[PDB]
Design a protein around this ligand. Structure first.
Ligand SMILES: *[C@@H]1O[C@H](CO)[C@@H](O[C@@H]2O[C@H](CO)[C@@H](O)[C@H](O)[C@H]2NC(C)=O)[C@H](O)[C@H]1NC(C)=O
Ligand code: NAG
Length: 273
């Protein structure tokens, strides 16, 4: 088995402006975001390729969970602002947490918060306890550890629940995270009025991201004039391109090369003038 990671990110604004939800939540599986929630629509919604997956998560029930989390998260931010006696300004709280396994073996976990960008507080499941970084975080620590069960719970989530959730998700996400969708390349050229002609090689619909793409002018690996790539989450695919300008008086042969983990041997698409 390989590496897989479940990560959640919560963002709250104490004084949100128009069209910007006061709270937002999102979760990623490796390099793909599989869900999102916000305080406006108030609903846990699957994303990308997970929109078509069934039986992995009762989104209607998670919606309720997210509302719960939201209330706590926002109460947390509220209290910090109360602490610094400054509710006229706008402040943000960001929570990041999750776990990761490698070879069906839990290989890591984390749970930390940031207030106005600086480290606010984090959990050390080895004590187990909360570690404060900001003075206000001391008050939070006190609250979050008022009962002995609390740290036990936080610990249980990081070492049991989260990874359990990750294993489950992996079952329903094989046809997603373990894909080897080979790239469809496409060579094309454009002549800007006044400039040299330029050749653009485009590899698309491939997954994972790691990939090699370069032009060759006479079997010689050229230096790209402009490079670029992207990730389409809804699709769950990657695109990557390279461009080269060709001398107005050049006849040499131009071919595009594309190496990808899903190819038995590299691909070569020559450009026909
Ligand atoms: C995956 O999604 C991407 C983005 O929606 C698709 O890329 C577009 O493909 C159309 C052709 O149908 C092009 O005309 C667009 O220019 C592309 N969007 C851009 C600018 O990236 C891609 O076709 C989809 N492929 C799969 C496997 O469904
Ligand atoms: C780890 O994977 C095995 C199958 O490879 C599965 O039976 C097991 O339940 C998973 N996690 C553990 C150790 O329970």
């Amino acid at each position: 088995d390989g590496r897989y990671s479940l990560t959640y990110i919560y963002t709250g604004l104490s004084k949100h402006v128009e069209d910007v939800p006061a709270f937002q939540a999102l979760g990623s599986l490796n390099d793909l975001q599989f869900f999102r929630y916000n305080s406006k629509d108030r609903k846990s919604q699957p994303m990308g390729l997970w929109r078509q997956v069934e039986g992995m998560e009762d989104w209607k029930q998670d919606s309720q969970l997210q509302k719960a989390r939201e209330d706590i998260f926002m109460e947390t931010l509220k209290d910090i602002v109360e602490y610094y006696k400054d509710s006229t300004g706008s402040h943000v709280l960001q929570g990041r947490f999750g776990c990761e396994i490698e070879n069906n073996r839990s290989s890591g976990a984390f749970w930390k918060y940031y207030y106005d960008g600086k480290d606010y507080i984090e959990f050390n499941k080895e004590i187990p306890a909360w570690v404060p970084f900001d003075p206000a975080a001391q008050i939070t620590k006190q609250k979050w550890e008022a009962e002995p069960v609390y740290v036990q719970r936080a610990k249980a989530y990081l070492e049991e629940e989260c990874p359990a959730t990750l294993r489950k998700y992996l079952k329903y996400s094989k046809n997603i995270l373990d894909r080897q969708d080979p790239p469809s390349v496409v060579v094309t050229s454009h002549q800007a009025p006044g400039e040299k002609k330029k050749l653009k090689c485009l590899a698309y619909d491939f997954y994972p991201g790691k990939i090699d793409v370069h032009w060759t002018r006479a079997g010689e690996v050229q230096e790209p004039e402009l490079r670029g790539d992207v990730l389409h989450n809804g699709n769950g695919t990657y695109q990557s391109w390279v461009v080269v300008a060709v001398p107005p008086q050049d006849t040499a042969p131009y071919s595009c090369h594309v190496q990808h983990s899903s190819l038995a041997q590299p691909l070569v698409v020559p450009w026909e003038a």
